[PDB]
Design a protein around this ligand. Structure first.
Ligand SMILES: [Ca+2]
Ligand SMILES: [Ca+2]
Lengths: 90, 89, 91, 90, 91, 90, 91, 90, 91, 90
């Protein structure tokens, strides 16, 4: 699943790889579930899709907190922008 | 690029879609750049790859803050876990 | 995501399409998470991946019950084979 | 497999073989079902519907195997399958 | 699902498209099921995979017979080569 | 091209893999060539595409005969259904 | 299958598209068949794969001749390099 | 890039593979460039796309001549059909 | 990942590979971000996406400069065409 | 080939899209050609592959100049970094 051979990757790089792809997959799931909630024509199914969608957000947040704790620049950039006021850019 | 016809998706759902796939691509970029930093055998290139990696992290954080401000569940779950000290589970 | 024009598909066919891919999505997550749990060298991360892994199993089970309730043959085949003993073939 | 088999347990690799099989049957059910709706030939429609329902059978068989070889599969399947009332309230 | 717009495709062409991809997908399943039978280290799973494998062959055979009945060249070439003896390339 | 490591696949299994994917590729070619025959607005091109289409059918039939001769249940199931009359679901 | 919408593509451009991808698919088939001919351990199959391989070359040549006849730059460049002697880069 | 392990493929088979996929790439570029020439609304870009397109045709022809010189059946079939007059089904 | 085995590649060829794909991915992001800038209906998001778009151009430009310094024909062709007045098809 | 419907994209954005993908595919060809040049064991093919490789570099440079002329931030960032000396990070 990695793009360079494992033999040349540090342990810490492969562990961050596992978390990042996990966040990606959860993000993708949130997006698709959200679209199916809008498009679904069965309310029972919609309730399931909406419930699962929100748990995927939880999974992404958990794995993202791990990344923050194990990468100096994730912690720096997240602290800069998350739970801030005014223009997100400046 | 969406999985459902745009005609059945709310406008707010499609804007969150644009943010989500933006974070995904930045995350993918961080991961690939990080691997090339480890595998690179040219110091000049490694410096570029490491610099760009760190800005991709910035892009993800910026877009993720937007999601936090425009989706209550993102805001709830991000508030629970982010900047916590202690077991994540 | 449908392979046929939506104009010709019954609603229940498209809703089952949404449910089936949801199960597929979750099953893929279960498998990948499980492999990362084995391969991970950080216990903290492993705890997260194992927790998420088991909730994906929950998502699949929820969506599969919906399929059981909205498809006569899903219900027949799930009734035949699930929660049984002995050879799974011919049972 | 997304990790090298050298670090995966044999039980993990067997569940991988089962999970992928359920996925492929689920995908076949979905595609067959759509072609049944779209087919304009009576004899083809009958074949596709016959195969569709056997793909459900394949998935159910392999899904039972997972139930017997993974405690959490057994737990979550037991919670939700063959129930009445809201699926999101259980 | 098709390469050209459905507007310009004849009806029979789209039906044969549905049959062909069904044969393709069944063949793909036979191959993957067969490889997992060799690699599986669990006898109960191996029995399931082998059972499903052979049913996929039946699905492929059914849909291929439909193709034979609805396409003159499928019927001709399948008549030339199937159930024959001696070098296949010969006939 | 195989899903499992060659270390664990029987020789015969890999040869059937080579035949199966060959039939798949020819079938895909038949399908796409046929769609291009319908859509083409150049008769010279249509004549080539139709000629190639029918030879891809020949390739598939040839490779399928080999599978029939080297796999018992290919032979059984093909014998049941091919060159028959009445409903195929039988 | 078209990178751009058909509404803006001239019909001649889409016809050349159909020929180009046909040649591409045949080239891919030649390559794969040739690799399977080398790796196969069953002579009967090898003979079939080798036969099919060479007919795929014929399909590519046929469709390529059509391109030569319907594109002036295909004709120019195919005339420069095909059936020549000496370094290809210097012809 | 190869569908079989390099250990069982002859040297010359792998070289023809490198030539074939190169022609495939060139053909793909020719097609896409041509489509962008039709859809482009900027004359400067269209001039570039058309110039690059025609050089991709040159690349394909060069590599194709190499195949002709290193594969007897390529030489046979190209000799049969190229630079001819009359129906291409000949 | 690479197409040829890493055992037949020079160390420089693989480093240029690492540079090229970085440019490709940066270019892809510029294109996608720019399309989202046009389609977005939320000004906040539009400002973020437009900001990220322009930083991707820097990533592409930086990595492209590295290629110029590490490949003779990149230096030649980039010297010929970039920062020039007149038609690009004649420089 | 665009990710948003062409109805919501400005005309100039789609023209830059056509240029960008052209540069991307040209870069992709350069990379693959370069790897085949290293791995090829036939000198005559290597000479062809190396020649085509360098013309792909030319195509990318041409299309890249057009982008520089039709996008203010491409012109800014390319001016900053191309044809410089010292560390590219600063
Ligand atoms: Ca997924
Ligand atoms: Ca036009």
């Amino acid at each position: 699943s990695t793009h360079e051979p494992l033999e040349v990757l540090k342990e810490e790089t492969v562990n961050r790889h596992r978390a990042i792809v996990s966040v990606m997959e959860a993000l993708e799931a949130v997006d698709w579930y959200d679209q199916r909630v809008d498009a679904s024509t069965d309310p029972e199914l919609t309730a399931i899709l909406a419930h699962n969608r929100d748990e995927e957000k939880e999974h992404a947040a958990m794995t993202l907190e791990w990344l923050r704790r194990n990468d100096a620049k994730w912690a720096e950039h997240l602290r800069t922008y998350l739970f801030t006021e005014g223009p997100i850019t400046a």
